[PDB]
């Protein structure tokens, strides 16, 4: 007999209760092939969590471009936007594409990664690298910080809880990467600053997690994906998106944490 959905979904529609929106949540463990579903087949807008998907696809491109990550860009002002610490500390010698893609991904740096998609041809040339992965759900169609805007009922710059997971982990996991590519992605995604409160908070210490956070700041809209690696067993790859109706409805970090505490515990 199969899991009873039901369920598994209750304690999500209860979250859902107080928050005041919606939580889309999918969560695959790579060992058993056990998998949590709820709402995962919604769209929720990407906010900064796409520049995860955009390192792994500069990665992909230095497959074919020998030293691209070592390359400096060297930019002006029109390159920098608001929440860009990184490439703000850096106008006046610039930014590898390797510093860049660690400081889009390490940092959410807004101009960082704008600094990449203009390497891959725009929003469409990410939403294409994700096409040839498989990834149909997936769609970043503006650039930062437009592409934020969260307004309910548009599909850009969104993709669904379960596209998200089985993108991240034919990244990560997979081999759809070249093995010092994939490596070099899950060694950025470890190294994340802005996660702390989300997906990990509800994961043991002594567990390795790597993830990607967004905040829209409007909406309700935030969220986090993850690969997590309990200790002597298969790692699980998840993802938590939110949004809600009103302009003024707060993301809550808090919420995140425990969806994603709710999926991880649900796993077998
Ligand atoms: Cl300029």
């Known amino acids: 007999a ?22 889309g949540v999918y969560a695959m463990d790579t060992g058993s092939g056990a998998t949590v579903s709820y709402r995962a ?13 955009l390192a792994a696809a500069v990665l992909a491109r230095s497959q074919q471009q020998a030293g691209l990550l070592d390359t400096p860009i060297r930019y002006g002002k029109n390159a920098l936007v608001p ?3 990184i490439s703000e500390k850096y106008l006046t010698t610039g930014m590898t594409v390797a510093e860049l893609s660690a400081a889009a991904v390490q940092y959410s740096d807004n101009a960082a990664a704008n600094l990449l998609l203009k390497e891959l041809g725009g929003p469409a040339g990410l939403t294409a690298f994700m096409r040839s992965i498989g990834d149909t759900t997936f769609r970043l169609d503006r650039w930062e910080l437009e592409l934020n805007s969260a307004i309910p009922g548009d599909a ?19 081999s759809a990467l070249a093995a010092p590519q994939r490596q070099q992605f899950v060694d950025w995604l470890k190294g994340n600053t ?7 908070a509800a994961v043991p210490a002594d567990w390795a997690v790597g993830d990607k956070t967004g905040t829209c700041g409007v909406y309700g809209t935030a969220n986090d ?32 944490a425990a969806a994603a505490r709710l999926a991880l515990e649900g796993l077998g």
Do not use: M
């Open 83 to 85: 929440w860009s610490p």
């Open 225 to 256: 994906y993850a690969v997590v690696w309990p200790t002597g067993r298969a790692p699980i790859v998840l993802a938590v998106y939110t949004r809600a109706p009103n302009k003024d409805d707060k993301h809550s970090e808090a919420v995140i």
């Open 194 to 200: 802005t996660g702390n409160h989300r997906i990990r």
């Open 41 to 53: 087949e919604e769209r929720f807008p990407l906010c900064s969590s796409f520049k995860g998907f």
């Open 156 to 174: 850009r710059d969104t993709s669904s809880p379960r596209a998200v997971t089985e993108s991240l982990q034919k990244l990560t996991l997979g």
């Open 2 to 23: 199969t899991a009873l959905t039901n369920l598994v979904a209750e304690p999500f529609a209860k979250l859902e209760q107080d928050f005041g929106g919606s939580i």
